[PDB]
Symmetry: C2
Subunit: 170 residues, 2 copies
């Protein structure tokens, strides 16, 4: 929790289990990784005073999802922007020093009200940690937004991610 | 609204714009396509009497997402199972004969309470159309579940997809 920003290389290290250690939170590797960098992460501040993350994904026309989604009509899948938010909430839990593997548990409400085209430059994620619970399972609840070149386009309320150690199962 | 089941070849045709025609609903192509076949589609029946879809994805250990999500811990991304549901709701709107390009608009509550491992055989999607609205924009609201080998593992309430006869204002 000493470090407050992460490069792409740090995130790739995380995807190999080499940032938080084996059996702890892992980002997906490409092509499921939806984050290039984390520009801010903290356990204080944010909308609820319980922490926040700001992260970025650079957009270029050659990103793999543009070719297949959709043919003749390239647009970033909303589900992947949403997944970036789960990825970040999972990363937060690992970053705090909690053990166990990350699993997205769902969301309260998701809204898509804009799009990421291949001509965009940069997607930014803003995640506000609402609550962390440490009862039987460690979990985080958060709200998030996705913005493209300054403009808010997706929101999610009540994003939930849990950590599962060897003794707990799905 | 005449054909009630679709093969993978039909879905691939749909991803090329060749099922519903240019400018109308399109499934994503691989690797974003999350459906192998639609085993049932109808505009009557289902939980609300307004239609339903049953669709399937065959699972094998070589599906692309297993290698990157996660290294040493393969599991289907929940976001892609969720996307299968938006893909199916969009397909429903095209299948009804409505014009325009599909865009997922979001969801009410989403829950992940199980997982698809590479040792699973088959994922099944059950979608219940709740409402279709034709006032300003054509849209569908639906509930859905994802099951693996008989066992329910994901649910979504209030899935929303809209059709856009032009995407320039989204």
């Amino acid at each position: 929790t000493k470090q407050h920003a992460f490069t792409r290389e740090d995130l790739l290290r995380c995807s190999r289990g080499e940032l938080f250690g084996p059996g702890n939170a892992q980002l997906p590797a490409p092509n499921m990784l939806m984050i290039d960098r984390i520009v801010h992460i903290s356990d204080v501040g944010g909308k609820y005073g319980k922490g926040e993350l700001v992260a970025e994904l650079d957009i270029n026309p050659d990103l793999w999802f543009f070719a297949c989604h959709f043919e003749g009509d390239p647009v970033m899948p909303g589900c992947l922007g949403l997944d970036a938010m789960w990825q970040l909430v999972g990363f937060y839990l690992g970053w705090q020093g909690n053990p166990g593997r990350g699993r997205a548990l769902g969301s309260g409400e998701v809204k898509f009200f804009g799009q990421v085209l291949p001509t965009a430059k940069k997607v930014t994620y803003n995640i506000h940690i609402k609550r962390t619970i440490n009862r039987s399972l460690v979990l985080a609840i958060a709200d998030g937004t996705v913005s493209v070149d300054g403009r808010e386009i997706y929101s999610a309320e009540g994003l939930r991610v849990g950590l599962f150690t060897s003794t707990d199962s799905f």
